[PDB]
Write a protein that holds these residues in place. Structure first.
Motif, PDB file in Angstrom:
ATOM      1  N   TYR A   1       0.853  -1.188   0.000  1.00  0.00           N
ATOM      2  CA  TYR A   1       0.000   0.000   0.000  1.00  0.00           C
ATOM      3  C   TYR A   1       0.886   1.233   0.000  1.00  0.00           C
ATOM      4  O   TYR A   1       1.790   1.352   0.837  1.00  0.00           O
ATOM      5  CB  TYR A   1      -1.035   0.018   1.151  1.00  0.00           C
ATOM      6  CG  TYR A   1      -1.872   1.282   1.105  1.00  0.00           C
ATOM      7  CD1 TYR A   1      -2.710   1.540   0.028  1.00  0.00           C
ATOM      8  CD2 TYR A   1      -1.751   2.262   2.089  1.00  0.00           C
ATOM      9  CE1 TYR A   1      -3.460   2.716  -0.044  1.00  0.00           C
ATOM     10  CE2 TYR A   1      -2.469   3.458   2.012  1.00  0.00           C
ATOM     11  CZ  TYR A   1      -3.327   3.677   0.945  1.00  0.00           C
ATOM     12  OH  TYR A   1      -4.035   4.854   0.836  1.00  0.00           O
ATOM     13  N   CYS A   2       0.634   2.170  -0.953  1.00  0.00           N
ATOM     14  CA  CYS A   2       1.384   3.420  -1.122  1.00  0.00           C
ATOM     15  C   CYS A   2       0.458   4.612  -0.819  1.00  0.00           C
ATOM     16  O   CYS A   2      -0.329   5.015  -1.677  1.00  0.00           O
ATOM     17  CB  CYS A   2       1.965   3.517  -2.536  1.00  0.00           C
ATOM     18  SG  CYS A   2       2.886   5.051  -2.859  1.00  0.00           S
ATOM     19  N   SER A   3       0.531   5.162   0.418  1.00  0.00           N
ATOM     20  CA  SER A   3      -0.374   6.238   0.796  1.00  0.00           C
ATOM     21  C   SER A   3      -0.201   7.512  -0.036  1.00  0.00           C
ATOM     22  O   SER A   3      -1.211   8.178  -0.282  1.00  0.00           O
ATOM     23  CB  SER A   3      -0.278   6.531   2.290  1.00  0.00           C
ATOM     24  OG  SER A   3       0.995   7.054   2.614  1.00  0.00           O
ATOM     25  N   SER A   4       1.039   7.816  -0.545  1.00  0.00           N
ATOM     26  CA  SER A   4       1.274   9.009  -1.383  1.00  0.00           C
ATOM     27  C   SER A   4       0.601   8.909  -2.779  1.00  0.00           C
ATOM     28  O   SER A   4       0.541   9.916  -3.515  1.00  0.00           O
ATOM     29  CB  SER A   4       2.769   9.272  -1.536  1.00  0.00           C
ATOM     30  OG  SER A   4       3.393   8.256  -2.298  1.00  0.00           O
ATOM     31  N   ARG A   5       0.024   7.748  -3.113  1.00  0.00           N
ATOM     32  CA  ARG A   5      -0.737   7.597  -4.352  1.00  0.00           C
ATOM     33  C   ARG A   5      -2.154   7.051  -4.109  1.00  0.00           C
ATOM     34  O   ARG A   5      -2.879   6.839  -5.083  1.00  0.00           O
ATOM     35  CB  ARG A   5      -0.028   6.644  -5.310  1.00  0.00           C
ATOM     36  CG  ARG A   5       1.317   7.143  -5.802  1.00  0.00           C
ATOM     37  CD  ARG A   5       1.149   8.170  -6.903  1.00  0.00           C
ATOM     38  NE  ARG A   5       2.448   8.602  -7.415  1.00  0.00           N
ATOM     39  CZ  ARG A   5       3.176   9.577  -6.882  1.00  0.00           C
ATOM     40  NH1 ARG A   5       2.736  10.239  -5.808  1.00  0.00           N
ATOM     41  NH2 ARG A   5       4.353   9.901  -7.410  1.00  0.00           N
ATOM     42  N   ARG A   6      -2.522   6.722  -2.839  1.00  0.00           N
ATOM     43  CA  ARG A   6      -3.805   6.081  -2.467  1.00  0.00           C
ATOM     44  C   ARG A   6      -4.017   4.830  -3.355  1.00  0.00           C
ATOM     45  O   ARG A   6      -5.097   4.615  -3.911  1.00  0.00           O
ATOM     46  CB  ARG A   6      -5.000   7.067  -2.549  1.00  0.00           C
ATOM     47  CG  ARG A   6      -5.037   8.109  -1.444  1.00  0.00           C
ATOM     48  CD  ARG A   6      -6.199   9.060  -1.695  1.00  0.00           C
ATOM     49  NE  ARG A   6      -6.105  10.289  -0.900  1.00  0.00           N
ATOM     50  CZ  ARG A   6      -6.441  11.498  -1.350  1.00  0.00           C
ATOM     51  NH1 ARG A   6      -6.870  11.656  -2.602  1.00  0.00           N
ATOM     52  NH2 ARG A   6      -6.287  12.567  -0.576  1.00  0.00           N
TER      53      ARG A   6
END
Ligand SMILES: Cc1ncccc1CC(=O)N1CCC[C@H](C(N)=O)C1
Ligand SMILES: [Zn+2]
Length: 139
Positions: free
Chosen positions: A58-63
């Protein structure tokens, strides 16, 4: 940010641990950027016990979630930051993918369960701190 919740344990990036995490400390390792604290509530995340080298993080800076191939856990040189001087971080797995500092704590999972959490990045390479060897997380 982000954490793994398994049994009466909370696994977080050591550099992001709170005062409550340190007040209920179970185990910490600066060389791995890991800290485990105890919880009152019971967690139900599943830890993978395998040698998978493919998963989804999971990459929060790209949702967004991204599928990746990653290296086996090893000693990798990590540049200095405000949290650590330049050093080798152990049990680290690298993949070609996007990350930014606030992405630390995002989970990497394979078909067997949780593999680790985002811990390092830069130059289009993301690093995950492995948790699969911490067999005690289940007892
Ligand atoms: C995650 C990320 N992605 C891109 C650029 C920068 C970063 C942040 C990063 O690598 N760090 C800072 C926080 C502590 C980390 C560590 N385990 O030593 C290293
Ligand atoms: Zn697996």
């Amino acid at each position: 940010s982000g954490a793994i919740y398994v049994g009466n344990y909370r696994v977080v990036n050591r550099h992001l641990a709170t005062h409550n995490d340190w007040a209920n400390l179970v185990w910490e390792d600066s060389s791995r950027d890991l800290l485990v604290s105890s919880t009152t509530a019971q967690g139900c995340d599943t830890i993978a016990r395998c040698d998978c080298q493919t998963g989804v993080y999971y990459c929060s800076s790209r949702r967004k979630h991204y599928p990746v191939s990653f290296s086996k856990p090893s000693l990798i040189f990590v540049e200095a930051s405000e949290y650590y001087p330049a050093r080798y971080q152990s049990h680290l797995m690298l993949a070609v993918g996007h990350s930014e500092p606030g992405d630390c704590g995002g989970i990497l999972r394979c078909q067997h369960g949780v593999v680790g959490i985002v811990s390092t990045g830069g130059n289009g390479l993301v690093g995950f701190a492995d948790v699969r060897d911490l067999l005690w997380l289940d007892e």
